[PDB]
A = this chain, B = another copy of it.
Amino acid sequence: SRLAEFRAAEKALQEQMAQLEALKKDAGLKREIEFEQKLVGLMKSYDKS
């Protein structure tokens, strides 16, 4: 019921969302997303013969 526990959740959400903005900046994650887009498109073309 408390408003205090809402604003504690609001702060908890905005640091979670802040560390997702940190994760989003990692060079290793970026290389890995690209490699997946490569793998996805390559199995896209493997379909055709």
Interface residues of A (CB under 8 A from B): 1-3, 5-6, 9-10, 12-13, 16-17, 19-20, 23-24, 26, 28-29, 32-33, 36
Contacts and interface: CB of A to CB of B under 8 A. Distances in A.
Tell me the number of copies of this protein.
2
Given A3-B33, A32-B3, A17 B13 contact: yes
Consensus secondary structure, chain A interface: helix
12 contacts: A1-B29, A2-B23, A2-B29, A2-B32, A3-B29, A3-B33, A6-B20, A9-B20, A13-B13, A13-B16, A13-B17, A16-B16
A35 to B, nearest CB: 9
A24 B20 CA distance: 23
